[PDB]
């Protein structure tokens, strides 16, 4: 096949204008879209906290508003799922994934104003969910609206812009581009077969959704944790640990959510009222515990920082890890809509900090800062439950620009992907696909 | 050039007490431990304690309760020890030294001249 | 806490001469550091990581070792290589210096 590559190599990388153009307007949107649907979220997580102000004197009457408040949001994003497009639920990554497969279809005139208003439900409520969810689903469906308006064909089409939509949906999530576009590349992309995916232009929809974000969020970053101390030779050995501790946990994480989604749906066994009355109770349950133990609920974003500096007690971390195990499986697990990367930062930092302690405490020949082992377990659940490692290693080194613990980073993540490989687990967001394709077929 | 340069050590009475100052001149003196060494008269090089560029972990040698006291003031680019109930064991040259690495075995980079400290009635 | 004992705790040796003295130590002991100390001076870090040579340290000096036994040496002692040599450990905890090895020329 020699004069086809001699004819393939000199036609290699020549995107059409076409799609060039389109895949810049699909991040444009995508851009917009994410950053008004967490500027909405926001504005919901305070007038939450503006109703706790005006009931502040009666503790029972106090942890009653705080109840319903997430109550009422949560059953409203239940709701709005299950009735208009079942399949924005949860995170959302699944079926962007599926569609690339061409085995599910992207119903985008039902599911953007579903995700959109369900999710700001669902997470303005603090619940236990991640913008990802949101934003990379809606962001694919925008791909996929625009491909429809100016009905463009092809396979590369549908695919790239299907793709840069994701990928845009990724970056704008965590100002994140290098993350999007390698979760892509990594882990979006058909696994099994070759693909046209036109790469020139997921960075082209990548660039102008980042640059949409920057337009409306600078001079702050989600996560700051400064500037740590470095590793040297003589430590890594034990990042490698912590590694294969997580490569058992991930695996194990993973059967939980799965059996959690089965756990909760004999709950209301399909039922459209059981079903939104259980997240009233599970977003409920939410926003008291933001009340009464914050670093238990919400996104995880917020005490990431606070580990990291070594500012929780090694009593606090155990606390929290279990704690946010719990409503992390009742807030995804019960379907509600929005991701599970950004509280799987939470749950590796959590787990990186109490390591971290323990090792400075073993060996002060070795000089320990407990925030360095937190920032190589930051990537290590999605490394060893999703089985992005890469995804989660560059988005882990853009959102906290510590690049001299890159080794200790790589090598955790390694550790944590090898033994969950060898424990015996599976890439969750493939294991939730088949699950929906071995029922789209179950029932015949 | 990169310079430490100590001072406080005097003569000093019994059951007295003194705080030595180290000032650090040249370099980020932020981001590095410091050390402070000290030499009995003729005789070995023993290391008193270490202090993390936060200030959150400060070790000191397998000896006695508020014996010393090891702080930095990062802003000022000064480190600093308080040596308690001053004993005649404590008369010797006190070393401020700042700490590095390798493969990872802690070595003392950078050391000062020193400062003496008499400690007689 | 883990001792360090120097070998020859004074001795002479010419210029141009081969000058060899030991650190050897009470547990194991990983990657051994030696300062020179003149009469007057800070001590200075000489050699790391039981082999490195600091930036300046002139060639003709080495150090060697595993385990429980080092040395420094020198392939042609010069006049300027009279001082004291400290090793000096921190493969555990806490660190610990040698006694001194005391180097004098002969004449």
């Known amino acids: 096949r020699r004069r086809q590559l001699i004819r393939q190599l000199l036609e290699r990388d020549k995107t059409p204008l076409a799609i060039l153009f389109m895949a810049a307007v699909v991040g444009t949107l995508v851009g917009l879209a994410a950053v008004a649907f967490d500027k909405g979220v926001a504005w919901l997580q305070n007038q939450r906290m503006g109703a706790l102000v005006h009931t502040a004197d009666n503790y029972p009457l106090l942890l009653t508003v705080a109840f319903l408040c997430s109550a009422v949001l949560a059953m409203f994003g239940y709701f709005l799922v299950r009735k208009y497009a079942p399949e924005a639920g949860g995170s959302g990554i699944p079926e962007i994934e599926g569609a690339l497969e061409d085995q599910r279809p992207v119903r985008w005139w039902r599911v953007l104003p579903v995700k959109f208003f369900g999710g700001l439900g669902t997470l303005g409520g603090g619940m236990v969910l991640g913008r990802d969810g949101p934003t990379v689903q809606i962001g694919g469906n925008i791909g996929r609206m625009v491909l429809d308006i100016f009905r463009l064909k092809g396979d590369e089409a549908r695919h790239t812009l299907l793709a840069t939509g994701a990928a845009a949906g990724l970056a704008a999530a965590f100002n994140a581009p290098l993350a999007g576009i390698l979760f892509i590349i990594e882990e979006m992309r058909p696994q099994f077969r070759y693909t046209l995916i036109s790469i020139k232009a997921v960075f082209i929809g990548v660039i102008m959704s980042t640059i949409m974000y920057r337009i409306f969020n600078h001079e702050v970053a989600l996560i700051d944790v400064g500037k740590l101390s470095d590793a040297p030779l003589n430590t890594l050995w034990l990042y490698l640990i912590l590694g294969i501790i997580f490569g058992i946990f991930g695996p194990i994480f993973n059967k939980w959510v799965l059996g959690m989604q089965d756990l909760l749906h004999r709950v209301h066994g399909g039922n459209i009222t059981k079903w939104v009355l259980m997240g009233g109770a599970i977003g409920g349950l939410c926003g008291l515990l933001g009340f009464v133990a914050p670093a238990t609920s919400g996104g995880g974003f917020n005490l990431i920082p606070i580990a990291t500096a070594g500012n929780f007690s090694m009593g606090m971390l155990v606390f929290i890890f279990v704690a946010r195990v719990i409503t992390t499986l009742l807030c995804f697990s019960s379907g509600a809509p929005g991701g599970i990367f950004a509280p799987m930062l939470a749950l590796g930092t959590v787990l990186g900090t109490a390591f971290g302690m323990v090792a400075v405490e073993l060996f002060p020949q070795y000089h320990l800062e407990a925030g360095t082992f937190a920032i190589a377990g930051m990537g290590a659940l999605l490394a060893a439950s999703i089985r992005a490692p890469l995804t989660g290693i560059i988005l882990v080194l853009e959102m906290t620009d510590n690049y001299q613990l890159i080794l200790p980073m790589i090598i955790t993540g390694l550790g944590a992907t090898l033994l969950a490989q060898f424990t015996g687990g599976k890439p969750l967001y493939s294991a939730i696909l088949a699950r929906t394709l071995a029922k789209q077929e179950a029932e015949q | 050039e990169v310079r430490l340069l100590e001072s406080g050590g005097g003569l000093v009475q019994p059951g007295g007490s003194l705080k030595l100052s180290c000032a650090a001149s040249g370099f980020d003196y932020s981001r590095y431990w410091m050390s402070w060494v000290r030499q009995a008269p003729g005789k070995g090089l023993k290391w008193i304690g270490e202090?993390?560029?936060?200030?959150?972990?400060?070790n000191y040698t397998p000896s006695l309760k508020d014996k010393f006291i090891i702080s930095r003031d990062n802003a000022k680019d000064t480190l600093y020890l308080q040596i308690s109930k001053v004993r005649s064991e404590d008369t010797a040259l006190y070393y401020c030294?700042?700490?590095?690495?390798?493969?990872?075995?802690?070595?003392?980079?950078?050391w000062g001249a020193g400062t003496t400290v008499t400690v007689s009635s | 806490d883990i001792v360090l004992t120097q070998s020859p705790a004074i001795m002479s040796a010419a210029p141009g001469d081969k000058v060899t003295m030991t650190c050897s130590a009470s547990?194991?002991?990983?990657?051994i550091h030696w300062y020179q100390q003149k009469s007057g001076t800070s001590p200075k870090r000489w050699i790391y990581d039981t082999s490195k040579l600091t930036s300046g340290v002139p060639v003709r000096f080495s150090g060697s070792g595993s385990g429980t036994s080092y040395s420094l040496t020198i392939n042609t002692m010069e006049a300027e290589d009279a001082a004291t040599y400290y090793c000096q450990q921190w493969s555990s905890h806490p660190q610990t210096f040698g006694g001194g090895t005391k180097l004098e020329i002969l004449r």
């Open positions: 547990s194991s002991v990983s990657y």
């Open positions: 030294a700042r700490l590095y690495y390798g493969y990872g075995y802690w070595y003392f980079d950078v």
């Open positions: 202090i993390n560029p936060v200030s959150s972990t400060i």
